[PDB]
Design a binder for these strands. Structure first.
Ligand SMILES: *OCCCCCCNc1c(NCCOCCO[C@H]2O[C@H](CO)[C@@H](O)[C@H](O)[C@@H]2O)c(=O)c1=O
Ligand SMILES: *OCCCCCCNc1c(NCCOCCO[C@H]2O[C@H](CO)[C@@H](O)[C@H](O)[C@@H]2O)c(=O)c1=O
Ligand SMILES: O=c1c(NCCCCCCO)c(NCCOCCO[C@H]2O[C@H](CO)[C@@H](O)[C@H](O)[C@@H]2O)c1=O
Ligand SMILES: O=c1c(NCCCCCCO)c(NCCOCCO[C@H]2O[C@H](CO)[C@@H](O)[C@H](O)[C@@H]2O)c1=O
Ligand SMILES: [Ca+2]
Ligand SMILES: [Ca+2]
Ligand SMILES: [Ca+2]
Ligand SMILES: [Ca+2]
Ligand SMILES: [Mn+2]
Ligand SMILES: [Mn+2]
Ligand SMILES: [Mn+2]
Ligand SMILES: [Mn+2]
Lengths: 233, 233, 233, 233
DNA sequence: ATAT
DNA sequence: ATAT
DNA sequence: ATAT
DNA sequence: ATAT
């Protein structure tokens, strides 16, 4: 199977697989069962911002998820990603729906990685996604160009989201996530998202993830698996 | 054939194909016969710096090449790259040798591209090249990892450059070089290089280039063709 | 008197002092009488974007001004700023009103300057202005904090722009704009602005400027003098 | 007195004031008596790199100090700088000598601060310091321009360092270090340094510091006080 | 930019 | 490096 | 770039 | 929202 590190914005509690009984953000290390979660007051139909940060000095993966008129949710986990990820990775966004549904609309995405050894750097910023975006690998249901946005999961022409959908967007270039020689390795990711449901239970969520370079949507990974994992282990 | 725009650091005069009688820098638009050249005092065995700049406002491709404690060489050509290049490109470095030879050593390479529509940006910086550099596509004789450098052309075990060699390195991700709705599109590239010849007459040169995404070394493009062009037309 | 280089967004034709008979952008080198102008369709009450660029290779000061869903206005002038400005400068925004008036609201301002000798760089970005913004020098009627915006000219309690007003904001740190040993010197500025007039004939305009470090609003430089020049010579 | 937060590279143990019995790096919060220290193998006459990082999510001030052929030293302290520093600060480098001496040579210094609320940013980079550097406030013995370096303390023409010297360099612009509205505030500082002594005990060290905007070298603050503190409390 |  |  |  |  793939190697996954992710930050999940989990809109739907799957009590049976160890989610808390509320919408939550979490840190996923090689399992959909988050090593750490925080309660998240997801605002149906509002544009939110996710900020993800890590550096090889603190070795602490942290995320903040926020809306304009509101308190942030934040979650952190101490993990040495040198011991988890391969040296070279792809970075991506992933989203899914199951019996329940939501738009998994990405309005912007930026990423920066640095190896300060003589610094190697990578930075990309998408504030507009276009119809034939050749620096993105789209997987499953993911599409670009609709209002300059990335729709990770299936949405109708009138803006109605579909169930049993899964989709991912990976940056085309492999990323040098860690290097043994590096004295400082850091990365940060920012995305803006619009999660909207007619349902009283939106599902299932959006994740920022880092994977082996050849990562693909695992078979059946709609619903609670967020397009990331082959099972709930 | 491929579409090529390039800045050549041409160490060897091929007067036969319209090079001036001296080492020169030039702007190449779909031909090895430069639309503009400037005289270049290439310093055998010294580390030089090439700076390349373009924006959609002035539509002027400019380059400056320098060594510490010496006058720069500079060349500029008015060209609308929207009318020359496809919307999506790859960017790369290329070098060749023929009957005469030189190290075509790259010590660092950086690149930035920006579309201000809401700005999309791409930036990479290599100050160290590693043995298995997965964000580079190496073509022909190009290798990485030797002293943390990119050797565009074949260098022997004893450090001797070889004749009739050609090699290129392209950044793995396609680049959105122009867009109809962009109000400002800009790019810049910087690389540092070490050209050393144990004989007199070094040959043949190093180029920064922009190509169609699927660009490959034209067969036989050693010597005066700089790994860029299938012929000297 | 001060040394001024500016890009004017001139909303009011002063044909008396050589303005064209229409709202225009221009390049001002030590005179309010622009060395080059382009026609500008200023959109009353809309948020616009000004982009300004210069490098020591082309020695061409260029500006583009745009609104969403409209054609840009662009203006360029060949000028060696090494021969005009002192080595160290301050950069700023300036605006004025006279018998006629307009809001001269700035929503965002960014600036980057680079001397590649070993690169020295300065970059600031304001997307929000605060009430006590200690990295800005406010001159004349300029205020910050009103809706997180910079109001270059006086606006009444009921939001009405006032006549005979002039105001400027300079970045607190002096900027190394050129250096003899630099092989490449470059700068760019971006600002977003909202010009609104409740009457017809808005006046008088907004400028990005570069000045001697100790620059101050010339006394009486309201109206057509744009807070930049002591007279119309 | 001033408010100080600093990272000290402390070359000289002052056992009487709570230094450990070896050259150390430490985190100083409003006292020369470090809240946390780590052992530091200072390499007399070699160029080192100091990296300092903080963000408002982890609220952990961390530093790494390294030389090319060697293991790094790293030190971290959990501290909410919102509760320690004023909202607006200056950032600087400081160094001192006493009975014992060392060159306190700074070869490069960079700084970035961001308030992600709509992001406000500041970035400067000095790879060359010039004789009349108007974006630096030099205090005490500090001088620029000698080989493009910043000498924080007195050095003779032949490169011999003097005792009882103290000097600081502050960036001219005030820095917005924290903001109540900000969802993420981050900063990072990098400097390259050359500490060289003929003595077997070099003294006294180099600090990166953040202070009230009007910070000045306290009276008598040579030797163990590093130009930062009025006393050893 | 529209009016005398 | 010198003082207890 | 220097030699025939 | 339905199953125990
Ligand atoms: O400051 C400039 C120095 C002057 C150099 C003058 C040229 N010297 C020279 C020539 N001229 C004919 C060019 O072709 C000769 C060989 O061609 C092969 O080698 C070159 C270099 O690798 C390459 O560009 C060609 O494509 C081909 O591979 C001589 O014959 C001679 O000597
Ligand atoms: O699309 C452009 C619209 C056409 C405007 C034509 C001018 N209208 C106009 C003039 N012309 C003379 C200019 O001076 C009049 C008043 O001058 C004062 O006000 C302006 C604006 O604040 C300022 O630039 C001057 O410096 C002075 O303060 C009229 O008299 C009239 O109406
Ligand atoms: O806390 C838990 C609930 N409550 C939600 C039930 C809906 C209430 C509002 C409608 O009346 C559950 N339910 C059991 C989990 O299984 C739900 C169905 O699973 C599918 O759908 C979800 C959402 O798309 C996916 O996560 C899942 O993979 C399945 O496809 C709790 O545990
Ligand atoms: O661990 C401690 C030492 N050892 C160093 C003594 C020199 C050994 C090599 C020479 O033979 C000390 N010494 C006592 C501390 O006082 C030293 C003198 O203080 C002045 O000089 C230092 C260095 O510039 C300053 O820090 C201080 O402020 C005074 O100006 C230990 O505690
Ligand atoms: Ca879930
Ligand atoms: Ca040639
Ligand atoms: Ca005017
Ligand atoms: Ca000490
Ligand atoms: Mn979960
Ligand atoms: Mn040529
Ligand atoms: Mn004008
Ligand atoms: Mn100490």
């Amino acid at each position: 199977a793939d190697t996954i590190v992710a930050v999940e914005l989990d809109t739907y509690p799957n009590t049976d697989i160890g989610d808390p009984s509320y919408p939550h953000i979490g840190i996923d290390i090689k399992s959909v069962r988050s090593k750490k979660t925080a309660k998240w007051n997801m605002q149906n139909g509002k544009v939110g911002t996710a900020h993800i940060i890590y550096n090889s000095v603190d070795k602490r993966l942290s995320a903040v998820v926020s809306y304009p008129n509101a308190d942030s949710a934040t979650v952190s986990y101490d993990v040495d990603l040198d011991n988890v990820l391969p040296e070279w990775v792809r970075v991506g966004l992933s989203a899914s729906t199951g019996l329940y549904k939501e738009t998994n609309t990405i309005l912007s995405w930026s990423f920066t990685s640095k190896l300060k050894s003589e610094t190697n750097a990578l930075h990309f910023m998408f504030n507009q996604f276009s119809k034939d975006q050749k620096d993105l690998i789209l997987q499953g249901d993911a599409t670009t160009g609709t209002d300059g946005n990335l729709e990770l999961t299936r949405v109708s022409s009138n803006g109605s989201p579909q169930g049993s959908s899964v989709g991912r967007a990976l940056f085309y270039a492999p990323v040098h996530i860690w290097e043994s020689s590096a004295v400082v390795a850091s990365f940060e990711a920012t995305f803006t998202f619009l999660i909207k449901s007619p349902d009283s239970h939106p599902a299932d969520g959006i994740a920022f993830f880092i994977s082996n370079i050849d990562s693909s949507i695992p078979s059946g990974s709609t619903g609670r698996l967020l397009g990331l994992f082959p099972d709930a282990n």
